[PDB]
Structures are given as C-alpha cells and as structure tokens.
C-alpha cells in the first residue's frame, strides 16, 4: 500500500521493536511456569491410574 510518513516515525518504530522484544521475553517466562505446573500434573496422573487399576 504505502509506508507511513518517513520521519519521526523512526523513533516510533524503534519503540515498537523494543516493545516486541520485551513481549517475547515475557512470554518465555510465562511458558516456564506453565511447564513447571504441567510436570507436577503428569506426575499425579500416574498415581491416579495406579489406583484405578487397583480398584
């Protein structure tokens, strides 16, 4: 189509780049906690299936 006007948008583009990088490196830190919970849940599932087989 058309690139936005070609001055004083440079500062805004660099700001948006910084924000996108911050977003990536925050989503990673959220996924870390998601995994740290998923592993405990996949641990409990084994005991659940064990008791089910017993009964």
């Amino acid at each position: 189509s058309q690139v936005s006007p070609t001055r004083m948008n440079l500062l805004q583009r660099r700001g948006q780049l910084r924000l996108a990088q911050k977003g990536v490196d925050l989503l990673k830190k959220k996924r870390d906690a998601l995994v740290a919970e998923f592993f405990g849940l996949v641990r409990e599932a084994m005991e659940a299936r064990k008791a089910l087989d017993q009964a």
Binding site: F38, V42, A45, M46, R49, K50, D53
Partner: protein, 100 residues
Amino acid sequence: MAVIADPETAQGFRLAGLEGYGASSAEEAQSLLETLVERGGYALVAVDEALLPDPERAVERLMRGRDLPVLLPIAGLKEAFQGHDVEGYMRELVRKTIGF
C-alpha cells in the same frame, strides 16, 4: 453415567446405577458412542479399548465446543496392568499438544 464394554461387565456396571450398554451391539463402538452422546444426558462415557477410542476426530466434530460427557479410555480387560501406566504416559504425552 455410561460405559461401552463387553456385556458381562456392562451388566456388572448396571448392578449399581450407571447404566451400561454392552459392546455386543457395537464392537467398533462408534455407533453406540454417537447414540449415547446424541441422547447426551450423561456426564462421561468410558469407552473400552476394543480397537481404539483415541481417534475422537469425529466425536469432537459432532461436539464442536461442548461441555459434553468426557471421553475416557477405561480398559480392555484384567489380565496384566504393569506397563499400562507408562503406555498411557507416553501416549498422552507425545500425541497430545506438548511435543516429543
């Protein structure tokens, strides 16, 4: 509130509530499962592993975002349950969302 397994254990389930519909009418069980979810008044449908209850493609096709009875593979029979733990472990792990 439902089950799909061989008739001797289907009537066993029937013994104390929780109507059982034997597998003598659907060994593939797709037909009976579809009919049971059609009637819909159930909270779960534990399907035996006659051939496979895992491909719920068409089941979730008919549901398409529903708080319906929860599909759950129950068992095939009782003769050995030693490696079934790690079998369910591996299968639920790699074939579901989280890779590897």
